Amino acid sequence: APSRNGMILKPHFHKDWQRRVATWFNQPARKIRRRKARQARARRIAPRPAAGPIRPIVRCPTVRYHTKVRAGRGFSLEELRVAGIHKKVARTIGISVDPRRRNKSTESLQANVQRLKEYRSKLVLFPRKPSAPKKGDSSAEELKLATQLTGPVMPIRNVFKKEKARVITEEEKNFKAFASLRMARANARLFGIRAKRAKEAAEQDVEKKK
């Protein structure tokens, strides 16, 4: 029974919804349970950081977000291979690894091997048995400054290149950006049918010559 000018509404209540209403009075108590086991987690691994292993620098897919950078799952096996890290002594010193990743561009692959470089230097490795330090260990006086790292370890900053003002040349002044796009839009659409009409453009001569 609609009234005068209104909006045609379709509420999704024809089912029996009043049996599956999830209320949220957990929410204030849920946060406390989360926080009090997040601190107890850090208490267990006290010198190791709170966020955990470091993540790689990762672009986004889906050309809406591809100008942005996230923290991916783990470093690819090529990134670890260049950096000189065994992929099984990698997770032990807090370096997240997933072999499912590939490297389609060295511009990103070079960007993470630098990241594994700095983390490998900024790390203070404790000796396994203190009375017998190995070669990989750190300097004994550096162990005293072992404070736990809070927050995401080496946080990713989506920084842009600070460029400076230029003086426009005659070429940039005389470039038809709109028409070149409409041109580029047209070629990538007709490229197929132009090949086919050019395919038998040679077939209508070879029957002519003989």
Binding site: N5, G6, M7, I8, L9, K10
Partner: protein, 124 residues
């Protein structure tokens, strides 16, 4: 808008009086010096007016400086500029009744059929 109404000829000494509020318009570059009296001025519109050497007044200071309203221009923002009035008037689905209907979302399959296409029944 008030810049547009104060650049009119027989003015530019008078004071701007508006009972509403003066929001900043980011699509204007130069700002003349102004003598403004409004109920409330947005934070950016203060900083852009005052940087141009202007003057912002409140209505208690307006009465002190001009009790009878002498030498002021009383203005008003666009009253029927709200989104709501585009639904008013004659109802849609009427000959020459360019009125926005209420739809839950716009798309190719929300009120593009029978009442609108001459191919589907009819149109107005």
């Amino acid at each position: 808008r008030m810049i547009r109404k104060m650049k009119l000829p027989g003015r530019e000494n008078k004071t701007a009086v508006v009972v509403g509020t003066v929001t900043d318009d980011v699509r204007v570059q130069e700002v003349p010096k102004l003598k403004v009296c409004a109920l409330r001025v947005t934070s950016r519109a203060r900083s852009r007016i005052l940087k141009a050497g202007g003057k912002i007044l409140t209505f208690d200071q307006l009465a002190l400086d001009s009790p009878k309203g002498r030498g002021t221009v009383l203005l008003s923002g666009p009253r029927k500029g709200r989104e709501v009035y585009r639904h008013f008037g004659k109802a849609p689905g009427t000959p020459h009744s360019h009125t926005k209907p209420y739809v839950r979302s716009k798309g190719r399959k929300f009120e593009r059929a029978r009442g609108r296409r001459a191919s589907r029944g009819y149109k107005n």
